[model samples]
Target chain A: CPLMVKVLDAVRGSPAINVAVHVFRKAADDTWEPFASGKTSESGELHGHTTEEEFVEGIYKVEIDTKSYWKALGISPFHEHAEVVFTANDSGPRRYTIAALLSPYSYSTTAVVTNP
Target chain B: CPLMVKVLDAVRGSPAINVAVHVFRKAADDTWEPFASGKTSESGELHGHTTEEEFVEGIYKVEIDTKSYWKALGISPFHEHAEVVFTANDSGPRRYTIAALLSPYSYSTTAVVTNP
Candidate 1:
């Protein structure tokens, strides 16, 4: 896989389970077109979103539906959603791992990229 | 002040200096209105953006200009910017600290709220 996402619940200090993730790639017309989507597992990780061949050089966006995740837990969150938008495979074909930490009122996201 | 922001660079594992931060509050008509703005200090932190009396219960957004920060360092970054949007002081007035981690291709944001 060329891309992976991991989510953590800051309030519980554990992996966020079953959070929704949607991926998009910028098209030629400067619009974000859907590329892939998935949900995090029990371990708060999502893999197999796309392969290297499919994830070419371009700008990409990852939208994490965190409101639903907190709502299900009976908490009212602040943000409508959490999104990370960045360029991918610009220098070359690289593997990306996005780690996001969430709270009822706040959240944080970080990325780790490696040469695979 | 009731709000603070700290930024770190994941690529260099150091404080992200001189990054611009813009703060906005949601208006009654559902539009974002500028509230405060500042740049990170040498320690990669911004404080005194808003006073506790001014920071009432409402939705707020923090826009971090990560691209410019990287560009100043002679590095090309992915995302045009990074933003953190959430409700603040809903239950009551509280202090908020936003911590963001950034990379050339990825970024993470987390929040710490406290009763003061």
Candidate 2:
């Protein structure tokens, strides 16, 4: 797979399970079009969303639905959602791992890109 | 101050200096109105952008100009910018530290909220 995601719960100090994640690629017209979507596993990771053929050179957005995650935990979160957008595979083929740390009132996201 | 920010460069494994950070609060009419703005220091941190009175209970957005930071380093970044939006001081007065780790194509953000 060319892309993967890992989510952590800052409050619980554990992996964030069942969090929804959506991926989109920027179209030539400057609009975002859906590519793939999935939910985090018990390990707080989502994988196999896209392969090299499908994850081409372009801008990509990773949207993490954090509000629902906190809501399910009986907490009210601040943001409606957390999103990370960036260009990919521009210099060459690369693999991406997006990691997010979540709290009811705050969250953080980081990305790691390596040659595939 | 009630709010602070720390930005790190994942590529260089160092502080992301001179990155612009903008703070906004969601107004009653549902619009993001600017509150304050600043740039990261040599330590990749921004302080005094907001104070206890200014940082009230409300939705806030912190926009980090990651692209410009990378551009200044003579590199092309993937994301045009990175942002963190969330609620603050709903339960009570608190201090927030927003930490972000950035790479050319990837970045992660985390928040630590504590009592004042």
Candidate 3:
């Protein structure tokens, strides 16, 4: 299954639409490089593929453009950026969902795989 | 002027549709009571009227029902509720807008009035 991601308003629980959700892998050189990228739908969700990289697993991170997003809404952002970092796995052919909930002050994320 | 409110996804510069935005006033009993309420539109904005209450200046609050909204999106909420508290005024016949920007981790709100 594919790996999926969703961005939600932490305070309101509604989808974060139109903003870019980016996936990056920590390379061996300690630099972060882009893996796959897409904008969230009206539902605030985006999906990626493990098959693209043969299910290799390591430290991964997601970056959300918190500053610009809040600027558009005319609010002073509590944080310049929103992100998630963790070690992950390769569940080939099975789908897992990465959910990120965000508020102006903070954010939280998790990975859940579909049941067999 | 009327008081207005808007709920937005903090991570993305998009409106939070179909979520309720409730405004409450503090009463003599020290209890927070509902004053005005409505749901966000496709533009993620809601407006209220100050003319209704004679523009008494005191402590007022706005709540976002964080838990239920997050539950609907199938996410575990970091906080059960989201709110804003402030001392305000009654600008008769003028319009003020309260903007709330939210993410899974936090939120921020402000009141802006239209120029005469």
Candidate 4:
């Protein structure tokens, strides 16, 4: 199953448009390896895929490229990026969902369960 | 005329919902004195009143109480609050509009000219 991720403008309560999103998985060396990258859709959402056959039960990271977005908007950025770190559960057919609520100045991220 | 300050979710590009907003003026003592405060409307916007009669041409500050908003949303906050600072002009009408774009993790603010 694919991991589902969504980014939103929490202040606007709308999809964050055209923002870059990145995913990383922790390697055995205790370092992070880039796993996926994409930009948000008009709905401010993005998705990543991983199969049980390829899944590893460990820490994963999601980073929002806030700097790029601010630069494009011609505003001085207060944050370089926002980060979310989570531990993957070694459950059956493991795929998880994470959502980020963001503004230009603040951010919050959470793990959510949904019907796949 | 009144100073207009609007808060929005930079990621979502929507009005920040019911977030606390504060305004301060630089006092002659070189200190910040609370001038006004309110909550964002459903549209993620808040307005402050300051007539030419009451306007002080100096540095003024606007602060977003992100901690309170994050607490209500049950998300860990990466920012305690967001801040904007600008020089209040002695220009005609003496009112200015400042808008903030924010995420839970990042933020940007700007000054804009608008018709009264």
Tell me, by lDDT, which candidate is best: 1
lDDT of 1 at A99: 83
- The residue ranges of model 3 lying beyond 4 angstroms of the native Cα positions read A1-116, B49-53, B90-94
C-alpha lDDT of residue A98 in model 2: 83
Query: A22-108, model 1: which lDDT tens digit per residue?
Result: 999999999889998899999999855477788899999889999999999998776778988888888899988888888776676
Q: Report per-candidate DockQ.
A: 0.45, 0.41, 0.20, 0.14
lDDT, candidate 1, B1-116, per-residue tens: 78899999987879999999999999999889999889999899986556778888888889999999999999977677998888888789887888888877767677888897
**Taking the tens digit of each residue's C-alpha lDDT, what string does model 3 give over B37-84?**
777788987656546356567677887775666567665667777787
Q: Please give the distance, in angstroms, between residue B85's alpha carbon in candidate 1 and its true position after superposition.
A: 1.7
Worst 10 residues of 3 chain A by lDDT: A47-56
A22-51 in candidate 2: lDDT tens per residue?
999999998889998899999999865567
- lDDT (Cα, tens digit) per residue for candidate 4, span A10-114: 544567789888889999999999878888888777754557566567787888887787677665556899888887764644557777776555666878754
Two-chain complex of model 2, DockQ on C-alpha atoms against the true structure: 0.41
lDDT of each: 0.86, 0.85, 0.69, 0.74
How would you encode candidate 3's per-residue C-alpha lDDT over A1-116 as one tens digit per residue? 25678887655557887767787888999999787777778898775544635545766777777667656767666777668776666443445577876666556677786644
Query: Could you give the candidate ranking by TM-score, starting with the highest?
Result: 1, 2, 4, 3
What DockQ was computed for model 1? 0.45
